[PDB]
Amino acid sequence: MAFSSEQFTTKLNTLEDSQESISSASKWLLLQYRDAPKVAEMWKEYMLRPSVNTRRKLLGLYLMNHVVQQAKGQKIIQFQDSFGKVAAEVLGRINQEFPRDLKKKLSRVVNILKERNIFSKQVVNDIERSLAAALEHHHHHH
C-alpha cells in the first residue's frame, strides 16, 4: 500500500543484487523521500530480524547504499540523515553474519561511504565501531 509500513518492505522482498533492480527500487524510494526516516527504521528492523538471510541483507545493503549515495548526489539529507544512523546497526550486525566475501562487498560500502562522507563522521565512526566490536579490533584513525 502507499506510504504504509510495508511498501518499502515489500521492495526488500523483491530486490535483486543488480544495478537496475537496485536502480528501479532506488529511484522509486527516492521519489518518496517523505518516508526517509520511517523506511530507515523499517529497513534496519527488517535486516536485524532473525527471519532475514545474508542475500536479503546484501540486497538491502545495496538498496540503501544507492539511496543514500544518490540522496547526497541531489542533497536530499533526509535519507542519508535517517539511513546513516541505522546503517551502523545493520552494516555492523550483518558484518557478524556475512561470510568474508559478502563482508568484503560491505567493506567497500563502508569505505566509499566515509570517503565520500555520505553520512556524518560520527555515523561513520559508529559504523566502524560496530564492525570493530564484531571482532574487538580497532585502528588509530577514523
Partner: peptide
Amino acid sequence: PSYSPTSPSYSPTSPS
C-alpha cells in the same frame, strides 16, 4: 546480480 558497492554517483559536500 551486477550492482557496484561503489557507484559513479557522488556530489560535493555543501551545507545547502
